[PDB]
């Protein structure tokens, strides 16, 4: 159905240890395709998916330049925000930026975004309409007046509604085998009685793409979430994902507990039962 | 493809 292309940027300052660390990563849905790390060998935008290696020398030259420009605004941004909040020169601070665009099942434009963080909390973000800004505080309000005068919103709106979705589509057909695959979960359930009075049923979901999955517990139809451990969805490292979910069950009642699995690679949703 | 016009905060 829907697809997306998102770019992630992290810049962290190194007080008395020189230039900042800068890392840039690009995704199409849940697949990383490009990278830049200020600490890597090459000093260029590097490929991370097979289908992007077929872009020629002008693409990489271009993306190296642009990613270095980003890195430069970030280098200054750390000094600017340090000034903005009157912080000392002795501490390490972090800037995060994420932009990107969503398309529908028809591949036409759906949504565009550009948000910005300072020390792990909101700073400024482009509003839904791509014309306006939300400033997080009195400092951030200064950035907002500056970005009105700089016409940032206008150039972002041209990118997000145009170039972001033009390039996503190029990527989506170049990596037909990879990006338009949908991988059904492999499911099984385990039983581990930790004591003589209680038992732990653990539903598993393994080998799935994309990462969006929903695992729920239930006793005889009604949605039990009271006695429930659910881990964060984690990467297997091969491109697919993993997730488990558990219940602490008063033992002998394991038959009237059901586990519900929702994923877009599954036609009908799955129920699971132990016996 | 990256955004081409990043501006200082």
């Amino acid at each position, epitope marked *: 159905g829907s697809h997306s292309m998102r770019y992630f940027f992290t810049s962290v300052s190194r007080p008395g240890r020189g230039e900042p660390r800068f890392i840039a990563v690009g995704y199409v849905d849940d697949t990383q395709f490009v990278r830049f790390d200020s600490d890597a060998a090459s000093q260029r935008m590097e490929p991370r998916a097979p289908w992007i290696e077929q872009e020629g020398p002008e693409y990489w030259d*271009g993306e190296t330049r642009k990613v270095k420009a980003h890195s430069q605004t970030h280098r200054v941004d750390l000094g600017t925000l340090r000034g903005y909040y009157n912080q000392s020169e002795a501490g390490s601070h972090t800037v995060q930026r994420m932009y990107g665009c969503d398309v529908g099942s028809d591949w036409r434009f759906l949504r565009g975004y550009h948000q910005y963080a300072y020390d792990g909390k909101d700073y400024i973000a482009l509003k839904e309409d791509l014309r306006s800004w939300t400033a997080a505080d009195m400092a951030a309000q200064t950035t907002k007046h500056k970005w009105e005068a700089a016409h*940032v919103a206008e150039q972002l709106r041209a990118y997000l509604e145009g*170039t972001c979705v*033009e390039w996503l589509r190029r990527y989506l057909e170049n990596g037909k085998e990879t990006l338009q695959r949908t991988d059904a979960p492999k499911t099984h359930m385990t039983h581990h009685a930790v004591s003589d009075h209680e038992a732990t049923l653990r539903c598993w979901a393994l080998s799935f793409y994309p990462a969006e999955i929903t695992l729920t517990w239930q006793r005889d139809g009604e949605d039990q979430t009271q006695d429930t451990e659910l881990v964060e969805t984690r990467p297997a490292g091969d491109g697919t994902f993993q997730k488990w979910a558990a219940v602490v069950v008063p033992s002998g009642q394991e038959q009237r507990y059901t586990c519900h699995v929702q994923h877009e690679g599954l036609p009908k949703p799955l129920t699971l039962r132990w016996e | 493809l990256l955004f*081409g016009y990043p501006v200082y905060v």
Partner: T-cell receptor
Amino acid sequence: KEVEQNSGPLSVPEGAIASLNCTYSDRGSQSFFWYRQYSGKSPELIMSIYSNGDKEDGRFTAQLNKASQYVSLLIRDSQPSDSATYLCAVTTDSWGKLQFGAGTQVVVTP
Amino acid sequence: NAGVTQTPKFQVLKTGQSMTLQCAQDMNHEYMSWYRQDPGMGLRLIHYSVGAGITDQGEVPNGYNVSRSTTEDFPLRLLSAAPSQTSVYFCASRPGLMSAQPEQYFGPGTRLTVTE
């Protein structure tokens, strides 16, 4: 030769439409410009276009088609004071070099 | 052109003379370029600078010289004038990272003629 432009000279009478073609080769280009330059002076910017489709400003209309890599400029109701050579200019980013064409000389006859 | 200014308007030199073409800019831009313009070659890039302190060469840098100590001025020195440097020269200005406005604006030009 990254930006290919209409050869020239183009001759239109007054009140007509002068249409100008431009073809670029870098697929990742993002910003697109038309410059007007009278003989013996500096190139002066008249039209910028940032996204696919048409943008109108007075007598000027510029189209962009990024799929087939094409910029245009249409001059509705042509004055004789439009007699200039018109430059197509193309860039990728803040830091990218601007890529100019050769220019097409437009002559408006009264 | 309320932003980009250049001095002088016109110049004659003989072979081996030195001169500097002043270029200034008003709009707090980071990215400045020097172009030469010639009948068969179109617009060609001489030297360019994306910030104060720093400069880099274009496609035709040979025999030209450039510095950028301030963000306002981008002077082009010619050290030993040669008859092939006979051209119109354009100072150009672009914001770079201080604004998202993509547009590059030109100075009014210096007509230079180098004779034997």
